[PDB]
Structure formats: structure tokens, C-alpha cells
Amino acid sequence: GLFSLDRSYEEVKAAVQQLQTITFRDATFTIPDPVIDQHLLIDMKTACLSMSMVANLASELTMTYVRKLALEDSSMLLVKCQELLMRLPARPQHVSPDDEIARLSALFVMLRQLDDLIREQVVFTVCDVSPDNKSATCIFKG
Amino acid sequence: RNMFCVKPLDLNLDRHANTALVNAVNKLVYTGRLIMNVRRSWEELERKCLARIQERCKLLVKELRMCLSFDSNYCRNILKHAVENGD
């Protein structure tokens, strides 16, 4: 839905045809009729507001952490993360644990709000399952 | 050495090294040292000038006291005033 904006019709078609598929535990599935609609537009608006809020609330140290760590560490996770990001020691510009902890708590709330968009209601917690995968014993929550 | 027209400075202070609070307090302590030094020097010159002028006046009035005459007594009555306050 987010990609549908700022993109042309055929680019949207290619992206949609890619995103329509999913792979999970040796199985694969296809999403039926994922058409963009005003219901999804509400989610887009709230998600983008939350995302810009987490962008603004982030402190200097939090933003600079990844770029600093890339200086002298190295791993496949790190190289992938750096490849995803754009490409362009010193004493920290400001140190203030009280203001920093307040900021990071606010950012924590904002991240929670952004995360709740995709988290469904956790209906079941499961126990041991019959090996034929047909039936299971579960506890009902929510 | 010269109180009247002193100039400030920026200390050529670095920003890469040292903690920032020490930078601020160093600028502050330089400013305080400058103001204290200039005010203290002005006060010291005032003290020395007042002491010297008082001693000179005392010696002059003692010398001129011996010549009892109208003009000399007028001079004495002028000089008898104290000068402890600058005004």
C-alpha cells in the first residue's frame, strides 16, 4: 500500500505481483485480491505519522550508533544492514542520560504504536500437536 | 599594565578534545580573571594615589604652618580638607 503511492501504474503492478506471494515453513501461499482501498489508506496515514514521529524522536546517539559501529566491526549481518543504508573518532557531542532516557522512552512508545499496526490479536497459545498436524491442544487468549 | 582599554579573547579553544563543560567553565574563568584583574588594578592605583596625595598635603600644611599670614592661612584652610573619598 505504501509503495502504491509515488509510483506509476506498471511499477505498482510489478511490485504487487511480487508482494502477492509468501513463503512459510516449506509451504507457499498467495494473497487473494490485495487491492488498494481507503481502509488501507487509514492504516497508511497512521503508520506514516508514527514512522515520522520515531524519526523525529530519535536522538543523536541512536542515529549515529550504526554508522559508528561500521567503522571497526564486521559481520554478514552488519554488511547487509550497511548495504541497505545510504553511504556518505570523535567525542560524543552531548551526554545526558536523563533527557536521553526520556527521549528513548517516548520513541519506545512510538515504536510500540507503529508495531501494533501489523500485530493481530493473539487468539491461541499452542501445546503439543498430533504428529499428523491435523489437530492440536491450545489455550484461548484475548 | 594598562586598565582602560583591555581587549577580550576567545582562547583558541578546541572542540574535538576535552569535555564541553570544561570548555564553558574555562571561558567563564578567563572572563572572571580578566574582570577581577582590571578592577583590582584600578583600585590599587586609586589607593596609591590617595595615600600619596594625603601624605603630600600633610607635609605641605606642616611646612606652611610656620608662616603665619593672611594668604598663607587661607592656603592652609583650603588644604585642611580631607580627601579620603574621591569626589
Side-chain angles (χ1 to χ4, degrees), chain A residues 92-109:
Chain A
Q93 313 290 344
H94 294 87
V95 176
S96 280
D98 183 44
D99 189 63
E100 191 61 30
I101 202 69
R103 263 181 179 258
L104 188 152
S105 186
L107 171 143
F108 183 80
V109 161

Side-chain angles (χ1 to χ4, degrees), chain A residues 30-134:
Chain A
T30 302
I31 310 175
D33 288 322
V35 65
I36 301 310
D37 201 5
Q38 188 272 353
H39 301 171
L40 182 140
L41 190 146
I42 306 302
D43 284 355
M44 294 202 289
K45 279 205 283 153
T46 193
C48 76
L49 172 61
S50 303
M51 208 186 303
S52 76
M53 285 314 301
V54 311
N56 184 266
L57 291 192
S59 58
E60 167 63 23
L61 189 58
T62 43
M63 297 286 285
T64 195
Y65 174 82
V66 173
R67 295 196 176 287
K68 288 166 66 70
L69 189 141
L71 184 60
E72 76 280 40
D73 202 5
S74 282
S75 182
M76 184 63 67
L77 163 65
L78 181 61
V79 69
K80 171 194 171 180
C81 187
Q82 180 72 0
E83 182 68 29
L84 284 157
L85 209 69
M86 77 180 290
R87 300 180 182 218
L88 275 299
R91 184 180 287 252
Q93 313 290 344
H94 294 87
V95 176
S96 280
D98 183 44
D99 189 63
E100 191 61 30
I101 202 69
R103 263 181 179 258
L104 188 152
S105 186
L107 171 143
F108 183 80
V109 161
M110 293 300 189
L111 286 169
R112 174 183 296 170
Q113 183 46 228
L114 178 57
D115 180 83
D116 79 9
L117 268 298
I118 55 171
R119 274 286 194 158
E120 294 290 331
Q121 183 80 339
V122 176
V123 191
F124 289 93
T125 301
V126 65
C127 284
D128 72 276
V129 65
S130 309
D132 76 341
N133 183 79
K134 286 293 185 186

Side-chain angles (χ1 to χ4, degrees), chain A residues 89-93, chain B residues 12-20 23:
Chain A
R91 184 180 287 252
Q93 313 290 344
Chain B
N12 187 44
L13 196 62
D14 306 293
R15 202 184 68 78
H16 302 288
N18 210 345
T19 177
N23 275 353

Side-chain angles (χ1 to χ4, degrees), chain B:
Chain B
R1 204 174 294 259
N2 178 23
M3 289 82 77
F4 296 158
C5 300
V6 297
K7 311 304 190 300
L9 291 173
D10 200 32
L11 290 77
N12 187 44
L13 196 62
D14 306 293
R15 202 184 68 78
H16 302 288
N18 210 345
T19 177
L21 186 143
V22 162
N23 275 353
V25 65
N26 278 331
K27 295 199 186 198
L28 191 148
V29 65
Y30 168 69
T31 309
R33 190 76 80 73
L34 180 141
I35 181 169
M36 292 188 302
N37 266 271
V38 65
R39 186 55 55 74
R40 185 189 297 168
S41 301
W42 192 39
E43 294 271 34
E44 173 70 10
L45 277 296
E46 174 160 291
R47 293 197 316 110
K48 187 148 59 72
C49 174
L50 290 176
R52 296 298 186 71
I53 196 170
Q54 281 173 108
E55 193 271 339
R56 263 46 176 162
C57 189
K58 185 181 176 186
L59 180 56
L60 200 157
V61 70
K62 177 53 179 176
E63 186 147 46
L64 188 153
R65 183 258 188 274
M66 76 169 64
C67 182
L68 203 167
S69 283
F70 156 67
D71 51 356
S72 302
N73 292 324
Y74 200 113
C75 194
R76 285 172 64 233
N77 282 345
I78 297 167
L79 294 182
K80 283 272 284 184
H81 290 304
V83 294
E84 208 282 323
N85 193 302
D87 203 54

